[PDB]
Design a protein around this ligand. Structure first.
Ligand SMILES: CC(=O)C1=NN2c3cc(F)ccc3OC[C@H]2[C@@]1(CCCN1CCN(C(C)=O)CC1)c1ccccc1
Ligand SMILES: Nc1ncnc2c1ncn2[C@@H]1O[C@H](COP(=O)(O)OP(=O)(O)O)[C@@H](O)[C@H]1O
Ligand SMILES: [Mg+2]
Length: 330
């Protein structure tokens, strides 16, 4: 049930000029990734895994979006709940994947940059889709980040990143949480997106001066909520609410990250079919507990490096990603 894809990034200019050796080969037609744990490219021992989809170094953002996100966006628009996670070591591409970057020299606008990642392609698509069709809809967004088991709002322009939100259980619906103070921002039109993100990109900067290795050690939850009051030609007014959470996890490398530790432990309990799952043992797992064995539809995108220095981290990721394939939800 939980879909897992592996994205492998190309050798960085640091490993480019250093003219090194790939220990990872990604076969998109075989949905398989293979790591060389031994030696010699003439004779080598290897480790091989199979996923739902693998994308090699030559994969572009649009490729990823078209293949994995687009189908999740369609389910969300229908009124369902979906979740996407980016898992993996630091410096392998979790952020390039969920956010993407800007092509240099102001070459493109935000909506056409080949480098844009999931989050911005999605926000744009939403408008591009519902706007056409005859629907009254509304988009809300939230960016909730976890650093050291403390909760932060990176979108609220009124309060600074030094003020942590509180989390309490939701008396109404069980297994839900209430985040006191989280700002939900309404995005009135496409040409109103980029600023919302620029503010986020700004506030995360101060968050970095305030907390060590923030960008590595924090988990961000980008949530977009769609309220659609559709009315097809028939004049049928369907009231749909779709929610999508885009999660860029802290770096899987190895103080302690209670949520990352709790995530893996939660995954274990679900694959090992154990009755007790430690959702409550971290903020991340309690917040997104429905994405993990609940009724949300979830995908994981693990990110790895071709580099041989990363061997250990790559097998740790490939492996962690592999077992999750066994989590069944919806
Ligand atoms: C304002 C801006 O340029 C951008 N803001 N982003 C952003 C902020 C956020 F709260 C949540 C999701 C996001 O997702 C998207 C990125 C990004 C770009 C990320 C730019 N980075 C921050 C600055 N950087 C450095 C190293 O200075 C590189 C990474 C983008 C936006 C639209 C189209 C393409 C790319
Ligand atoms: N698939 C890719 N193609 C090109 N550059 C990539 C790719 N994946 C990651 N990068 C780059 O490698 C670096 C690390 O990316 P980053 O998104 O910060 O990963 P992480 O968030 O896991 O640390 C950045 O320089 C980004 O440009
Ligand atoms: Mg990052």
């Amino acid at each position: 049930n939980i879909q897992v894809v592996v994205r492998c990034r190309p050798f960085n200019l640091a490993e480019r000029k250093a003219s090194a050796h790939s220990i990872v080969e990604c076969d998109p037609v075989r949905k398989e990734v293979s790591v060389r744990t031994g030696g010699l490219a003439d004779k080598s021992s290897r480790k091989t895994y199979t996923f739902d989809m693998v994308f090699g170094a030559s994969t572009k953002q649009i490729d990823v979006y078209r293949s994995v996100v687009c189908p999740i966006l369609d389910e969300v628009i229908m009124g369902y709940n979906c979740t996407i996670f980016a898992y993996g070591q630091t410096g392998t591409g979790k952020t390039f994947t969920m956010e993407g970057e800007r092509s240099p020299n102001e070459e493109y606008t935000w909506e056409e940059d080949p480098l844009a990642g999931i989050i911005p392609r999605t926000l744009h698509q939403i408008f591009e889709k519902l706007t056409d069709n005859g629907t009254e809809f509304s988009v809300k967004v939230s960016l909730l980040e976890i650093y050291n088991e403390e909760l932060f709002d990176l979108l609220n322009p009124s309060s600074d990143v030094s003020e942590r939100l509180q989390m309490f259980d939701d008396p109404r619906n069980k297994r839900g949480v209430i985040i006191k103070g989280l700002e939900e921002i309404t995005v009135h039109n496409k040409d109103e997106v980029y600023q919302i993100l620029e503010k986020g990109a700004a506030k995360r900067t101060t968050a970095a001066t305030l907390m060590n290795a923030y960008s590595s050690r924090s988990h961000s939850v980008f949530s977009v909520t769609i309220h659609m009051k559709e009315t097809t030609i028939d004049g049928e007014e369907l009231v749909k609410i779709g929610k999508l959470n885009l999660v860029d996890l802290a770096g899987s490398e190895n103080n302690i990250n209670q949520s990352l530790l709790t995530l893996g432990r939660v995954i274990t309990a679900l694959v090992e079919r154990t009755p007790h799952v430690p959702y409550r043992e971290s903020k991340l797992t309690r917040i997104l507990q429905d994405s993990l064995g609940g009724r949300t539809r979830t995908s994981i995108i693990a990110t790895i490096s071709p580099a041989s220095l990363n061997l250990e981290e790559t097998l740790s990721t490939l492996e962690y990603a592999h077992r999750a394939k066994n989590i069944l939800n919806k």
